[PDB]
Design a protein around this ligand. Structure first.
Ligand code: AMP
Lengths: 76, 985, 147
């Protein structure tokens, strides 16, 4: 299985994960490839924000799935 | 020649070439209803060359649902003629015109053509011409809670900037013989496969410094590959790489060709089967209108819905679409055909205006090509929505009633909202509320709060403020403008000038917060957001947060007892550089700007403040001697800025400026190079000044040089302002006085029981007694943008540029220095419009009182890449306390004002928990490790008395509750997390 | 931040640091006064160094402001007491306890880093004349860090 993560700035990240991996492992991989601490990562799949402690199979994340990595903004 | 005093924030987003191209483009807008007027407003604020409007239809009352430039006295007049007058005022550099008749050949005058409120046949006729003549064509529709956008920029569109990001750059550590570029220690390049980079300052491989881009093959977060550089050399060290962004060719299809085989943009991946449905539905709408003299299906009418679905089936069969039609969704499109919501108009107008800017400037990645959107989760479910309640009542809210009904209108009209901030998002929110009819009922009310006043750079993205309003309060002007838009709000809006923070809890207290229905944030900082979030959590009020940054934006919703609060999640913090890097070894312009800001603070605001406070505090020295780490610095500062260097004229001010120039740009560098010569080697034998450390060079003053003279003028003017003298800008006096200065000689020094204490005491007593000076004060220099025109930004620019020339860094001009030092946030009108639209779409969910967490959507978007994402809010966590389910955010203990012992016994008896720590505010009221005597003193006191005693400050008369944080552990010794306590005074 | 501060304080209390002892001032939780004993195998032997710790309003999401209060002759500590530590400026994460900070400071005192100094004068003395650096450190600790 292989998944893609798209940032809010257009960058694309390719991750090699298994269907049984926890969201914590995926966040650690994203930290390794990006340097973003897991507590500051907001992942979205099919309109659901992925939460720590659960596995990918809970969200029906299969191969070639696309996640979105987003963040909040402070202007106004 | 762009007006940087008005487009200051927009230049940080677009640029100079982009706006130069933008100001040479003509935009035609067909249709002047809510969507059309929103697009025209955003375009006028953006700054295109001119806008031409075409809408000869007479005004009707229902049009007032989303058209905010129409009034009840304009019924029967063509919409363009009544809208041009209001649009002409938004921007004085953008003429707005009207055409009473349109011809095909007349379309060649315009750079972009936007089409709204037009049938499909007319759209085909227009596009058949614009496509072959290479004119950008955008078509937008808004039907109830559904929206569509279509872009066609020609067959050979050229995009110069795709993602809109700043070019990437980095410092190398080694380039092997096979092009394996390695970054510095634990530094990430951030590139991606297929990118182009160009190198400079590469030692050992000078050929790579020519500047020819090379393909990048990312092999890891720290290293990448560029190819084979065998011929260019063997191995290279150090250097800096910078990304190169290349143009792209995007090819679009015409509308006639696009109808058969469209290409969709998906605003939500949770519903990927819908856009094919909307593609058929909108065409069926057009056919139905063509079959009924341009009459859309009536609201919640079933015969029209059946006929519309027959048209949908016919169209789907004709186009050979292998799509199974979802009857419910298509009939929903039919029911809301005549809907006209200001929120959907705002959202789509922001998006379409951004597309227009893309067409004119050739930047960012356009929509390619169909963008179908819906917010069907906002449809009320707690009220009656039928043909009876959705029929028009001959009022200005017909467009909204056609979607929601009259009962929901009554619900909206009795809202009591509270809006924090009245900037750009605040103005958009107020306009949306005025159009929607919020708080126009007998029990409605709106409260606006904002402590700032109108400036010149705020008018561009804030369309309610005019150049005649400069200097007034933002909230008052916004309230008056929106009362003009909707006269029914006269007397229903109250505006304050209070900063929302810990010091204004006497105004926004329990009584104020009990009557509200919801709170909407329109702030620009995180501290105020967190404070308002805590207040909403305590009072259990819904909160609507939204933020923007250039072309990016987000919106979040906080619902009591359902979702987590705003402060339950973290965001990346602002970067703070190491003190060693800032002080001695900078290698970037940001480091030098930070150093210059610190120099300003410590040279014009710290010493003056210390001097002023010394003359007032009688016991300052007593605490300073034992508390501050280096009282010697304080004493020397007071002496120097009080007695030793008191100026009277301006010549001595210029001499002092020259002295400081030598101090900070010539002598410290010499000392540093005496300590660490240019040929020194580290403890490992490697060169010292290699890589992140750049060897500095002392600067010798030269009056003719622009930078040195600018620094001298800025520093002298700031010093004069400090000492209240008459500054001058005539270069003759500066030239005369700087030539007679002989710098004192400077030579670096190598260095080489209670004397120090006695020395400090002697210095202290040497100062004049406090009674010597009474009523004498000096004015510290504060930081602003030409509001206090003491050359603040100019001084910082000169200091930073001089220090950059010290380390051979590339200097930055005043624009970038203002951007960095001022911490300005790039702002766009389109992003503001989109976030306001999303927030107002969530507001109707909040009004309806939806209880399921899947019915709310937090929204994120980036308009530079055409990305939209929505996700359900995170539910608040639960916990177990005493074998009961407790919410960790929205639950609290409500107790009377009881003695500390009674509170402890209550927690021991009811919750079965042992209290270990108890604190209120910033004070530790009780802790298990305190000595028995202290506790025995503090046990029989009430909580209010205990807090007053510990904080040494009586509670205010308006204070009606206390919030306590308690940490307690179970019987077994396992620490238990419990909610906060709410003591009722 | 009160709960986090109290939890860290209790964790310190349960297991003594031995070589360090940090605790609040008066009844205020956003201001601590820590103490450190110089390593035996270092020029700072037999010295007691006091530190002031100010917890920001956003703790642990913002690093604590730790400043020396005594006078110490060290390459990475300047006259104002500022400490050159990566975990206090930009490497701070909401998972580091004050015990970790005190261990890091003790390690810093154990071996200075003159390759990236904060006080170039002392770094130059350390790189050139080690014996003079040792004597100056001993004199400073016996004149300011004893009593
Ligand atoms: P954008 O920067 O365009 O406008 C921001 C507006 O928010 C107001 N504001 C900021 N911070 C506060 C607090 N703490 N209380 C009330 N209002 C605030 C600014 O005055 C701008 O109007």
């Amino acid at each position: 299985m292989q998944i893609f993560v798209k940032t809010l700035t257009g960058k694309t990240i390719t991750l090699e994960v298994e269907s049984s991996d926890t969201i914590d492992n995926v966040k650690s991989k994203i930290q390794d490839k990006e340097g973003i601490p897991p507590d500051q990562q907001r992942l979205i799949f099919a309109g659901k924000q992925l939460e720590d402690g659960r596995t990918l199979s809970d969200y029906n994340i299969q191969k070639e799935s696309t996640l979105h990595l987003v963040l909040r903004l402070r202007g106004g | 020649t762009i007006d940087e005093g008005l487009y200051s924030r927009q230049l940080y987003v677009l640029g100079h070439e982009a706006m130069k191209q933008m100001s040479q483009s003509n935009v035609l807008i067909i249709g002047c209803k809510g969507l059309g007027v929103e697009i025209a407003k955003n375009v006028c604020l953006a700054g295109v060359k001119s806008v031409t409007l075409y809408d000869p239809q007479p005004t009707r009352i229902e049009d007032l649902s989303s058209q905010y430039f129409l009034t009840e006295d304009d019924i029967g007049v063509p919409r363009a003629k009544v809208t041009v007058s209001k649009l002409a005022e938004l921007n004085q550099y953008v003429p707005v015109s009207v055409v009473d008749e349109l011809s095909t050949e007349y379309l060649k005058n315009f750079k972009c053509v936007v089409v709204t409120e037009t049938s499909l046949t007319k759209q085909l006729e227009i596009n058949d011409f614009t496509h072959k003549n290479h004119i950008a064509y955008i078509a937008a529709d808004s039907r109830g809670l559904f929206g569509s956008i279509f872009c066609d920029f020609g067959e050979n569109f050229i995009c110069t900037d795709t993602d809109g990001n700043e070019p990437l750059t980095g410092m190398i550590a080694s380039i092997t013989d096979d092009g394996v570029v390695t970054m510095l220690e634990e530094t990430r390049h951030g590139l991606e496969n297929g990118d182009f980079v160009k190198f400079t300052e590469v030692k050992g491989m000078p050929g790579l410094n020519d500047g020819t881009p090379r393909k990048v093959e990312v092999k890891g977060p720290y290293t990448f590959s560029i190819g084979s550089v065998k011929d260019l050399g063997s191995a290279g060290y150090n250097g800096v790489f910078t990304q190169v962004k290349v143009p792209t060719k995007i090819s679009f299809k015409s509308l006639r060709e696009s109808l058969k085989d469209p290409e969709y943009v998906y605003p939500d991946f949770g519903k990927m089967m819908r856009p094919p449905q909307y593609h058929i539905a909108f065409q069926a709408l057009s056919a139905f209108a063509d079959a009924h003299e341009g009459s859309l299906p009536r609201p919640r009418n079933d015969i029209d819905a059946a006929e519309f679905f027959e048209f949908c089936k016919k169209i789907a069969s004709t186009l050979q679409f292998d799509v199974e039609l979802d009857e419910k969704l298509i009939k929903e499109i039919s029911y809301q055909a005549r809907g006209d919501l200001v929120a959907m108009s705002a959202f789509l107008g922001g998006a379409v205006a951004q597309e227009v800017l893309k067409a004119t400037t050739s930047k960012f990645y356009p929509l390619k090509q169909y963008f179908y959107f819906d917010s069907l989760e906002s449809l009320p479910s707690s009220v009656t929505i039928s043909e009876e309640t959705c029929k028009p009542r001959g009022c200005r809210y017909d467009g909204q009633i056609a979607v929601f009904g009259s009962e929901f209108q009554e619900k909206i009209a009795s809202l009591s909202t509270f809006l924090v901030g009245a900037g750009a998002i605040g103005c958009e929110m107020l306009k949306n509320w005025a159009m929607m009819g919020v708080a126009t009922g007998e029990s409605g009310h709106i409260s606006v709060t904002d402590m700032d006043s109108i400036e010149k750079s705020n008018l561009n993205r804030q369309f309610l403020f005019r150049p005649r309003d400069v200097g007034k309060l933002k909230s008052e002007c916004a309230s008056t403008a929106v009362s003009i838009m909707n006269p029914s709000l006269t007397g229903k809006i109250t505006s304050y000038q209070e900063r929302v923070g810990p010091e204004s809890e006497g105004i926004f207290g329990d009584e104020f917060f009990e009557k509200l229905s919801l709170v909407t944030n329109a702030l620009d900082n995180v501290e105020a957001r967190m404070y308002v979030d805590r207040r909403c959590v305590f009072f259990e009020k819904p909160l609507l947060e939204s933020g923007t940054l250039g072309t990016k934006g987000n919106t979040q919703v906080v619902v009591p007892h359902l979702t987590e609060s705003y402060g339950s999640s973290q965001d990346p913090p602002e970067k703070s550089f190491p003190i060693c890097t800032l002080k001695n070894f900078p290698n970037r312009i940001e480091h030098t700007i930070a150093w210059a800001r610190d120099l300003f603070e410590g040279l014009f605001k710290q010493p003056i403040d210390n001097v002023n406070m010394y003359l007032s505090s009688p016991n300052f020295l007593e605490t300073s001697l034992k508390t501050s780490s280096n009282p010697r610095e304080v004493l020397e500062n007071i002496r120097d800025y009080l007695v030793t260097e008191k100026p009277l004229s301006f010549e001595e001010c210029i001499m002092w400026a020259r002295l400081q120039f030598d101090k900070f740009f010539n002598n410290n560098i010499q000392q540093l190079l005496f300590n660490f010569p240019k040929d020194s080697v580290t403890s490992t034998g490697q060169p010292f000044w290699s890589g992140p450390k750049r060897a500095p060079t002392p600067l010798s003053f030269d009056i003719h040089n622009r930078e040195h003279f600018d620094f001298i003028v800025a520093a002298a003017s700031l010093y004069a302002f400090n000492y209240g003298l008459k500054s001058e800008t005539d270069p003759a006096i500066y030239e005369r006085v700087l030539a007679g200065y002989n710098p004192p000689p400077f030579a670096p020094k190598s260095g080489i029981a209670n004397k120090d204490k006695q020395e400090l005491k002697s210095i202290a007593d040497s100062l004049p007694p406090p009674s010597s000076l009474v009523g004498f004060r000096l004015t510290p220099a504060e930081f602003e943008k030409d509001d206090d025109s003491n050359h603040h930004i100019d001084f910082i620019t000169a200091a930073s540029n001089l220090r950059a020339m010290n380390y051979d860094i590339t200097p930055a001009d005043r624009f970038k220095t203002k951007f960095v030092a001022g911490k300005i946030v790039p702002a766009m009108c389109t992003s503001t419009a989109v976030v306001s639209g999303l927030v107002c779409l969530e507001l109707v969910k909040l009004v309806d009182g939806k209880k399921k967490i899947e019915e709310y959507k937090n929204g994120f978007f980036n308009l530079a890449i055409g990305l939209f994402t929505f996700s359900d809010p995170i539910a608040s966590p639960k916990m177990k306390v005493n074998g009961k389910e407790i919410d960790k955010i929205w639950d609290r203990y409500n107790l009377p004002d009881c003695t500390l012992q009674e509170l402890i016994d209550y927690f021991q008896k009811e919750e079965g928990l042992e209290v270990t720590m108890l604190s209120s505010g910033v004070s530790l009221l009780y802790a298990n490790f305190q000595p028995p005597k202290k506790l025995a003193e503090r046990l029989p006191l009430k909580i209010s008395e205990l807090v007053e005693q510990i904080t040494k400050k009586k509670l205010e008369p308006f204070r009606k509750h206390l919030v306590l944080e308690i940490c307690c552990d179970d019987a077994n010794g396992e620490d238990v997390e419990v909610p906060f306590i709410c003591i009722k005074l | 931040a009160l709960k986090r501060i109290n939890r860290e304080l209790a964790d310190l209390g349960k297991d003594p640091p031995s070589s360090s002892s940090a605790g609040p001032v008066g009844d205020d939780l956003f201001h601590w006064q820590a103490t450190i004993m110089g390593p035996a195998d270092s020029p700072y032997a037999g010295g007691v160094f006091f530190l002031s710790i100010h917890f920001p309003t956003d703790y642990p999401f913002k690093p604590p402001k730790v400043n020396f209060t005594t006078r110490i002759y060290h390459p990475n500590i300047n006259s104002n007491g500022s400490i050159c530590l990566d975990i206090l400026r930009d490497q701070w994460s909401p998972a580091l306890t004050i015990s970790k900070v005190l261990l890091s400071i003790s390690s810093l005192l154990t071996d200075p880093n003159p390759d990236d100094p904060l006080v170039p004068e002392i770094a130059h003395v350390y790189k050139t004349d080690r014996s003079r650096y040792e004597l100056s450190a001993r004199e400073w600790t016996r004149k300011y860090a004893i009593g």
